[model samples]
Target: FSILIIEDDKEFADMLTQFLENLFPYAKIKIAYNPFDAGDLLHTVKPDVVMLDLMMVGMDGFSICHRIKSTPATANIIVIAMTGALTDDNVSRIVALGAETCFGKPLNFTLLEKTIKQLVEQKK
Candidate 1:
């Protein structure tokens, strides 16, 4: 499976990508440092799942989630929102925009991995 993570923090995104790589040894994983990069990857690479950072300076995760889920071609792709603090409001907001789920930063990598695998497999 292929996964794309859209996060503004370079350090955090890189490390998360590394961890994901370890977990899904045969999977393809890519990172987008900003919304536009995420947009580009969505068109070109077309991942099975997208992990989005909920808060960003330019074009927040809500917009991207809407974009992904609203667009016909990308709508089927699974989206998972992530943020510094995952609150009830945040979860509800992103869910309305079409994200399958949301997670807090410094994510429990174990759960993150498990959730990703579960959701992607189910989507298929």
Candidate 2:
């Protein structure tokens, strides 16, 4: 399965990519440093899932989520928003926007890995 990680922090993104790659040895993971780049990449890579960061230049996770949910071609791709602190309002808003899940930063990788695997498989 392929996963696209949209985050501005390169180091964090790389770590998450490596973590997922190691957990799902056959997984194809792509990382983007910002939403603009992520949007561009999405045009070429129809990933099974997206791990999106909430704070990014030009476009934030909410905007990207709206874009994805509105666009027909990209709408089916599962989105999981990653934030440092998720408020109740943010959680409800994200859910309403159609994200598959929402996760807080400094993630619990073990749980994340399991969720990703399950989501990837289910989507397939």
Highest TM-score: give the candidate number. Answer: 1
Name the regions of candidate 2 deviating beyond 4 angstroms: none
lDDT of each: 0.86, 0.83
State the displacement of the C-alpha of residue 93, model 2, in Å, after optimal TM-score superposition: 0.7
Global Cα lDDT for candidate 1: 0.86
Candidate 2 per-residue C-alpha lDDT over 6-111 given as tens digits, one digit per residue, 9 for 90 to 100: 9888889889998888887887889888666797888767787888888766776787788887799988888988888878888788878989888887888878
Clashing pairs in 2: none
TM-score of 1: 0.92
Return the TM-score for each candidate structure: 0.92, 0.91
